[PDB]
């Protein structure tokens, strides 16, 4: 009851984060990096995932906020090979590139050195660590191509 010293003892909504409904991306300050995209490309999916999983728990262990962990579409490259003493290039290998992303944010500037060292140290054989800064270009690259918008865009050109 409001007039009582115990008023508000049942308050709880201030302890929760405000989740009241697209979303603006928050860039980092001058002493912390913004959203960072830890890409993990590889020819063996199991190795791409096993290391993406490893770095999620690693980030989780270091109290580094992991905004999102997602997979990028698979790229299928057909290795063609010139036949011996001939001309017709005959396919032999069909390789596939599996990329996995672990999106973090709030990495301290001074601590980024220690973190970057640990992750590169543990990199498996066959996997490429590409750590870049998150940008709208990367986010848009995960969405299907829209041919209609391109056709209408040509009219404006």
């Amino acid at each position: 009851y409001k007039t009582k010293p115990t008023h508000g003892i049942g308050k709880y909504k201030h302890l929760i984060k405000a989740e009241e409904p697209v979303r603006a991306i928050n860039l980092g300050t001058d002493y912390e990096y913004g959203v960072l995209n830890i890409h993990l490309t590889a020819y063996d999916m199991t190795l791409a995932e096993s290391y993406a999983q490893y770095v999620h728990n690693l980030c989780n262990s270091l109290s580094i906020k992991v905004e999102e962990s997602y997979a990028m579409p698979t790229k299928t490259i057909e290795v063609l090979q010139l036949q011996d003493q001939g001309s017709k290039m005959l396919l032999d290998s069909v390789l596939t590139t599996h990329e996995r992303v672990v999106q973090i944010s709030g990495l301290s500037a001074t601590f980024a050195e220690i973190f970057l060292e640990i992750i590169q140290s543990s990199l498996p054989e066959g996997v490429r660590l590409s750590v870049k800064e998150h940008t709208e270009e990367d986010f848009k690259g995960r969405f299907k191509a829209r041919p209609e918008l391109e056709e209408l865009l040509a009219k404006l050109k």
Binding site: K2, T3, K4, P5, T6, H7, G8, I9, K11, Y12, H14, L15, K17, S63, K65
Partner: peptide, 29 residues
Amino acid sequence: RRTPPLGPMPNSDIDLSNLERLEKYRSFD
């Protein structure tokens, strides 16, 4: 009209400035 609490109120020692940083009861138990 308000009466001040007679002692520490529940949940007062929780720093809500760094809400997103604080650990959570991810579990029921």
